[PDB]
Design a protein around this motif. Structure first.
Motif, PDB file in Angstrom:
ATOM      1  N   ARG A 172       0.823  -1.203   0.000  1.00 46.37           N
ATOM      2  CA  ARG A 172       0.000   0.000   0.000  1.00 46.37           C
ATOM      3  C   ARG A 172       0.860   1.257   0.000  1.00 46.37           C
ATOM      4  O   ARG A 172       0.516   2.253  -0.648  1.00 46.37           O
TER       5      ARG A 172
ATOM      6  N   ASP B  67      -4.894   1.612  13.183  1.00 42.80           N
ATOM      7  CA  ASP B  67      -6.118   0.845  13.022  1.00 42.80           C
ATOM      8  C   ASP B  67      -5.829  -0.375  12.150  1.00 42.80           C
ATOM      9  O   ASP B  67      -4.680  -0.823  12.075  1.00 42.80           O
ATOM     10  N   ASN B  68      -6.848  -0.929  11.502  1.00 43.87           N
ATOM     11  CA  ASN B  68      -6.685  -2.107  10.663  1.00 43.87           C
ATOM     12  C   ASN B  68      -6.449  -1.704   9.214  1.00 43.87           C
ATOM     13  O   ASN B  68      -7.101  -0.795   8.696  1.00 43.87           O
ATOM     14  N   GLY B  69      -5.513  -2.391   8.564  1.00 47.87           N
ATOM     15  CA  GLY B  69      -5.234  -2.115   7.169  1.00 47.87           C
ATOM     16  C   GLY B  69      -4.391  -0.888   6.917  1.00 47.87           C
ATOM     17  O   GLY B  69      -4.539  -0.253   5.870  1.00 47.87           O
TER      18      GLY B  69
ATOM     19  N   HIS C 153       3.925  -9.960  -6.182  1.00 52.75           N
ATOM     20  CA  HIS C 153       2.729  -9.269  -5.719  1.00 52.75           C
ATOM     21  C   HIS C 153       3.021  -8.211  -4.665  1.00 52.75           C
ATOM     22  O   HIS C 153       2.105  -7.476  -4.280  1.00 52.75           O
TER      23      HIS C 153
ATOM     24  N   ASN D 250      -0.360  -2.367  -6.715  1.00 54.88           N
ATOM     25  CA  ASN D 250      -1.258  -2.843  -7.757  1.00 54.88           C
ATOM     26  C   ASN D 250      -1.598  -1.772  -8.786  1.00 54.88           C
ATOM     27  O   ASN D 250      -2.142  -2.108  -9.843  1.00 54.88           O
TER      28      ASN D 250
ATOM     29  N   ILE E 280       3.375 -13.034  13.863  1.00 52.68           N
ATOM     30  CA  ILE E 280       2.136 -13.609  14.369  1.00 52.68           C
ATOM     31  C   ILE E 280       2.268 -15.115  14.523  1.00 52.68           C
ATOM     32  O   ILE E 280       1.580 -15.721  15.350  1.00 52.68           O
TER      33      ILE E 280
ATOM     34  N   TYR F 270       0.414 -20.959  17.835  1.00 47.92           N
ATOM     35  CA  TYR F 270      -0.037 -22.148  17.133  1.00 47.92           C
ATOM     36  C   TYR F 270      -0.939 -22.915  18.087  1.00 47.92           C
ATOM     37  O   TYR F 270      -1.173 -22.486  19.220  1.00 47.92           O
ATOM     38  N   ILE F 271      -1.472 -24.048  17.620  1.00 47.37           N
ATOM     39  CA  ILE F 271      -2.220 -24.900  18.539  1.00 47.37           C
ATOM     40  C   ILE F 271      -1.303 -25.318  19.676  1.00 47.37           C
ATOM     41  O   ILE F 271      -1.703 -25.349  20.847  1.00 47.37           O
TER      42      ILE F 271
ATOM     43  N   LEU G 185      -1.298 -10.112  22.324  1.00 41.15           N
ATOM     44  CA  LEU G 185      -2.033 -11.334  22.024  1.00 41.15           C
ATOM     45  C   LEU G 185      -2.191 -12.159  23.296  1.00 41.15           C
ATOM     46  O   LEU G 185      -1.197 -12.517  23.938  1.00 41.15           O
ATOM     47  N   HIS G 186      -3.441 -12.463  23.654  1.00 46.19           N
ATOM     48  CA  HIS G 186      -3.775 -13.310  24.799  1.00 46.19           C
ATOM     49  C   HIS G 186      -3.182 -12.752  26.095  1.00 46.19           C
ATOM     50  O   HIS G 186      -2.377 -13.396  26.769  1.00 46.19           O
TER      51      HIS G 186
ATOM     52  N   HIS H 129      -2.439  -2.151  18.751  1.00 48.53           N
ATOM     53  CA  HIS H 129      -3.580  -1.266  18.561  1.00 48.53           C
ATOM     54  C   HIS H 129      -4.441  -1.120  19.808  1.00 48.53           C
ATOM     55  O   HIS H 129      -5.443  -0.398  19.768  1.00 48.53           O
TER      56      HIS H 129
ATOM     57  N   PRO I 157      -5.565   0.420  23.200  1.00 50.39           N
ATOM     58  CA  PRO I 157      -5.297   1.681  23.913  1.00 50.39           C
ATOM     59  C   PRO I 157      -4.636   1.488  25.267  1.00 50.39           C
ATOM     60  O   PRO I 157      -3.895   2.374  25.718  1.00 50.39           O
ATOM     61  N   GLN I 158      -4.874   0.351  25.930  1.00 52.45           N
ATOM     62  CA  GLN I 158      -4.246   0.124  27.227  1.00 52.45           C
ATOM     63  C   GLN I 158      -2.736   0.032  27.088  1.00 52.45           C
ATOM     64  O   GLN I 158      -2.005   0.387  28.019  1.00 52.45           O
TER      65      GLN I 158
ATOM     66  N   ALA J 223      -7.794 -22.185  17.567  1.00 51.53           N
ATOM     67  CA  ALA J 223      -6.949 -22.619  16.466  1.00 51.53           C
ATOM     68  C   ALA J 223      -7.423 -22.120  15.105  1.00 51.53           C
ATOM     69  O   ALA J 223      -7.050 -22.712  14.085  1.00 51.53           O
TER      70      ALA J 223
ATOM     71  N   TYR K 181      -4.530 -21.124  12.436  1.00 52.20           N
ATOM     72  CA  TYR K 181      -3.900 -22.020  11.473  1.00 52.20           C
ATOM     73  C   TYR K 181      -4.470 -21.861  10.071  1.00 52.20           C
ATOM     74  O   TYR K 181      -3.848 -22.326   9.109  1.00 52.20           O
TER      75      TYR K 181
ATOM     76  N   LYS L 186     -11.560  -2.609  -2.824  1.00 48.96           N
ATOM     77  CA  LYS L 186     -11.529  -1.703  -1.684  1.00 48.96           C
ATOM     78  C   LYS L 186     -11.162  -0.307  -2.167  1.00 48.96           C
ATOM     79  O   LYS L 186     -10.131  -0.125  -2.829  1.00 48.96           O
TER      80      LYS L 186
ATOM     81  N   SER M  41      -5.780  -8.190   5.255  1.00 46.77           N
ATOM     82  CA  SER M  41      -5.201  -8.193   6.587  1.00 46.77           C
ATOM     83  C   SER M  41      -5.705  -9.407   7.371  1.00 46.77           C
ATOM     84  O   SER M  41      -6.581 -10.149   6.922  1.00 46.77           O
TER      85      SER M  41
ATOM     86  N   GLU N  20     -12.803 -16.126  22.844  1.00 46.16           N
ATOM     87  CA  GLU N  20     -11.997 -14.925  22.625  1.00 46.16           C
ATOM     88  C   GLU N  20     -12.395 -14.233  21.318  1.00 46.16           C
ATOM     89  O   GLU N  20     -11.646 -14.178  20.343  1.00 46.16           O
TER      90      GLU N  20
ATOM     91  N   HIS O  59      -9.901  -4.343  16.040  1.00 46.10           N
ATOM     92  CA  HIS O  59      -9.723  -3.057  16.690  1.00 46.10           C
ATOM     93  C   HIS O  59     -10.984  -2.670  17.461  1.00 46.10           C
ATOM     94  O   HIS O  59     -12.059  -3.223  17.223  1.00 46.10           O
TER      95      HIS O  59
ATOM     96  N   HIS P 186     -12.467 -11.153  26.699  1.00 50.61           N
ATOM     97  CA  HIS P 186     -11.280 -10.779  27.457  1.00 50.61           C
ATOM     98  C   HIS P 186     -11.153  -9.292  27.750  1.00 50.61           C
ATOM     99  O   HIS P 186     -10.326  -8.932  28.592  1.00 50.61           O
TER     100      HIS P 186
END
Ligand SMILES: Nc1ncnc2c1ncn2[C@@H]1O[C@H](COP(=O)(O)OP(=O)(O)OP(=O)(O)O)[C@@H](O)[C@H]1O
Ligand SMILES: Nc1ncnc2c1ncn2[C@@H]1O[C@H](COP(=O)(O)OP(=O)(O)OP(=O)(O)O)[C@@H](O)[C@H]1O
Lengths: 427, 76, 445, 79
Positions: free
Chosen positions: A52, A70-72, A106, A110, A179, A183-184, A367-368, A395, A397-398, C193, C196, C333, C344, C382, C388, C413
């Protein structure tokens, strides 16, 4: 002047003999001191027609820079570009003209107006500076300009020469937690360490088993060395190798490998350090480091039973295995264990091994994690690893509410001249 | 291939000395396995398989005295 | 699951009594036409149809961290709130365990389900076994089920109670035997999961493929793609054929009407042409698509597409374009066309969740005019992954609005979602030491 | 053109078409007053089907200008 000192030392050694005097040469000592004084740093980066993003120049602080958005909004693109830039330096340092990761087809924008993609970067070591440009045009187009790698090969040469002269030379850590650190398995519950083999491993992380093995080995060394109870260990290992040779005289490749392993074990007398940073000190430093991030638990141990090793944790009044933890402490335990594993492994000379230099990239730090953990994670990471540079994204705020004003970068989308472009700003 | 090699032994007119040599090699293999059992799971398994093969060969040699099987007749 | 001489007892209109009456009746008559037209079958079908699936209550003893605890769940929406290590997942796996035996017994009777793993029982010294109990209420019909496992090393046996589930499953199989397109309940589980996610050219689709497993993982995404293109080509087949003829003739009439507007507006030929146009329009309206809602084709495809687009307001349209050797899904988009691999993480998560839910609902309810109104239960862990705060505030009400007859169990959460939930559907977990033993409690707000 | 070539080779059939049903899809052939599936054919019929199909595909792709592409020139070897 690091460059002048390096040039002088190379010139002096080039027209000289008796490598023993080359080791005794004051030029090598001066170069080592200069390298030690220098600190790793990435001052700025420019991005051109990548994903982008169409045009951007970013400058990063010394300690910590966090991108909130934010997202994207291209948060992961920045990390991917920095990983691409660091790949060439890693490959050149590890091996001679080792190719790195390229730019996929890619990855370019674009839009039909853009014809090529390019990334520029600059690295500073105290006073010395360097730069690198990586480019990749579109498909079916002329003017296929190439990438410049002279600066990175220059930097690399200094490090390889220094490590050649002194076997205890340190190296900068470069790692990337994407990210995929989830995993599991969650990085848990998915023959020998061979002492220390420096890892120019890929920045990403997929396997934590090494951690387990390495630890087991550190524990056996701790018991045998500091707590004695081994007598003439070198002589016993030599006798075991002699018995292996006698059996061989009386699967062949496996027997030969086992004989070489026995010889390596018998080389413990040859090593013979037992210094202040002994095995038990490293074991205690690792355990107390992990326990710093998990206030609820009490103690961690390694239990041998049924011809196998297992990890035992104590919580409240109940002892738990490693499979029974939740994802929250699985993530923290894996990330901290791997980071301190690399720090303790790539700096085998420092009195406190958690004082090296490096750069770490983390995506989605939250995450988590419940908000209570989110309010104090960054201060713990910053204090624990002082001489490292962090680049993280979030992202929540805390997370942002407890960050200094000079370290926060905000991404915005603004339409200029009828075209929406990404911009950055400070509060 | 195996059928041919066995018939070669019949052409060689191998006596009981071949059986004695095989038994001595089996005993040496057992001694080596016992030594290795003290202070290599794949190696131990391979040694056990080789000992089992040697025991089967010894039983085949014993069955050879009981009119054998005329491996040359099977080949023809 | 057997027959009886229909003990009189007292007059009642229970579903069980209708089931027994039908079983008694079918043991005498041999002709299938009479059975297929009997009034007992109509009573059984109507009672089964108007009943609404709803799990009532659950209790846990000595399973994982929880020592002893009972919960009651609302029939439309419930949310659990807590911190790390408070057994939020444990409840969800307990429900999935008890629902697996009902899933198993519908495919084929006397088929085992999921047991308790040996490392799930509590680690305390004084424990001996672990158990889970549940209850399902079909308006006025109640069933219950108990699953238990003894600790390894003990020498005292424990069994399971499986009369209720077997009896309930037999009703579903019996109704499925005598009705062409009978529906089935929906059970699903969206574990953590979903990260994955990132052939032999199957040609036959049925409602029993979604009953292979209760959990969602891996190849379901692959099959979703294969299913989607199968829908698209069906629309093309319906788009051709006689649907073109009425399209062309009406267009010609429109052109003629446009000409009547011109030429200064010009009976006889005009009357005949107008009558012919009226007759053709009457014939086409009389057909009413031939099968009306039943024909589906285009309507189903566009309902799925608009449902997906409901959760992503920043996109314009989604298209399926055939490449030289492969199929491609193309979005748009803003002013730039996008590919499915260039999205994303958040948009991918929403895309997979909504697509899987829509595919399951459509596959399970073929007879309904609008398949999005089926019954069932859905579990989510979760809900706020990779989202966001702007999307965190509106996900719940959109999920509840799109599927209004589905029971939801959700664990969260963060306090952002808590600002938009009614007080009657919130349960808060806590830790309290009572009588010298630490334990978990649930408190209503 | 390929379908008509196959139909010309075997005149005992009436039409061949691909049908998308409510839950599946299959290829239907009509002979006499009977509808048959592509998978009910024997091994010999399948062998003839693929042999003629490949021959017709090559002939059509090699003569894009002739009004009747089945009038090309060449040599075919069959064992
Ligand atoms: N070649 C491209 N041309 C135009 N837009 C693109 C191109 N590649 C990606 N994008 C856009 O980039 C946007 C953001 O993608 P990206 O992978 O950078 O996510 P992000 O915002 O960095 O991720 P995260 O949410 O994890 O922080 C997407 O919405 C997509 O529309
Ligand atoms: N056998 C066991 N005995 C005692 N405690 C156990 C046992 N197995 C698991 N636990 C406890 O379970 C806790 C985690 O439970 P659980 O995963 O349900 O919680 P959670 O963190 O809310 O869940 P999630 O993050 O997976 O959504 C651990 O802190 C551990 O103390």
């Amino acid at each position: 002047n690091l460059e002048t000192c390096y040039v002088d030392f190379l010139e002096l050694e080039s027209h000289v003999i008796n490598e023993d005097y080359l080791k005794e040469s004051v030029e090598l000592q001066k170069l080592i001191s200069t390298l030690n004084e220098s600190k790793f740093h990435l001052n700025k980066i420019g991005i051109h027609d990548f994903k982008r993003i169409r045009e951007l120049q970013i400058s990063l602080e010394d300690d910590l820079t966090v991108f909130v958005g934010d997202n994207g909004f291209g948060k992961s693109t920045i990390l991917d570009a920095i990983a691409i830039v660091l790949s060439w330096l890693r490959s050149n340092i590890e091996k001679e003209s080792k190719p790195g990761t390229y730019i996929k087809s890619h990855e370019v924008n674009n839009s039909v107006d853009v014809e090529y993609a390019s990334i520029d970067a600059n690295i500073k070591l105290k006073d010395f500076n360097t730069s690198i440009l990586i480019t990749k045009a579109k498909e079916g187009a002329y003017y296929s300009r190439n990438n410049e790698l002279l600066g990175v090969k220059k930097l690399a040469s200094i490090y390889r020469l220094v490590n050649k002269y002194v076997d205890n030379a340190s190296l900068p850590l470069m790692a990337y937690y994407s990210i995929a650190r989830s995993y599991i398995g969650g990085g848990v519950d998915r023959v020998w360490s061979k002492f220390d083999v420096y890892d120019e491993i890929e920045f990403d992380r997929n396997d934590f088993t090494d951690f387990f093995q390495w630890l087991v080995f550190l524990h056996n060394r701790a018991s045998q060395e500091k707590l004695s109870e081994s007598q003439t260990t070198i002589n016993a290992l030599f006798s075991d190798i002699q018995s292996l040779k006698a059996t061989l005289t009386q699967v062949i490749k496996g027997l030969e490998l086992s004989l070489k392993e026995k010889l390596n074990y018998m080389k413990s007398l040859q090593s013979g350090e037992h210094k202040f940073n002994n095995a038990v000190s490293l074991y205690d430093s690792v355990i107390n480091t992990i326990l710093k991030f998990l206030p609820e638990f009490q103690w961690i141990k390694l239990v041998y039973g049924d011809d196998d090793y297992k990890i035992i944790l104590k919580k409240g009044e109940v002892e738990l295995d490693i499979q029974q933890l939740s994802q929250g402490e699985k993530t923290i335990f894996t990330l901290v264990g791997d980071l301190a594993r690399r720090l303790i492994l790539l700096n085998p000379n420092l009195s406190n091994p958690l004082l090296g230099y490096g750069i770490v990239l983390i995506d989605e730090i939250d995450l988590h994690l419940h908000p209570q953990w989110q309010q104090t994670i960054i201060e713990r990471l910053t204090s624990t690893f002082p001489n490292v540079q962090f680049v993280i994204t979030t992202h929540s705020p805390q997370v942002l509410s407890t960050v200094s004003s000079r370290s926060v970068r905000i991404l915005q989308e603004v339409e200029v001249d009828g075209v929406n472009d990404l911009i950055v700003s400070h509060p | 291939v195996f059928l041919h090699n066995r018939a070669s032994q019949e052409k060689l007119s191998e006596s009981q000395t071949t059986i004695n040599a095989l038994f001595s090699d089996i005993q040496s293999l057992k001694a080596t396995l016992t030594q290795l059992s003290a202070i290599d799971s794949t190696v131990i398994k391979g040694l056990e398989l080789s000992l089992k093969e040697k025991l089967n060969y010894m039983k085949s040699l014993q069955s050879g005295e009981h009119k054998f099987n005329n491996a040359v007749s099977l080949y023809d």
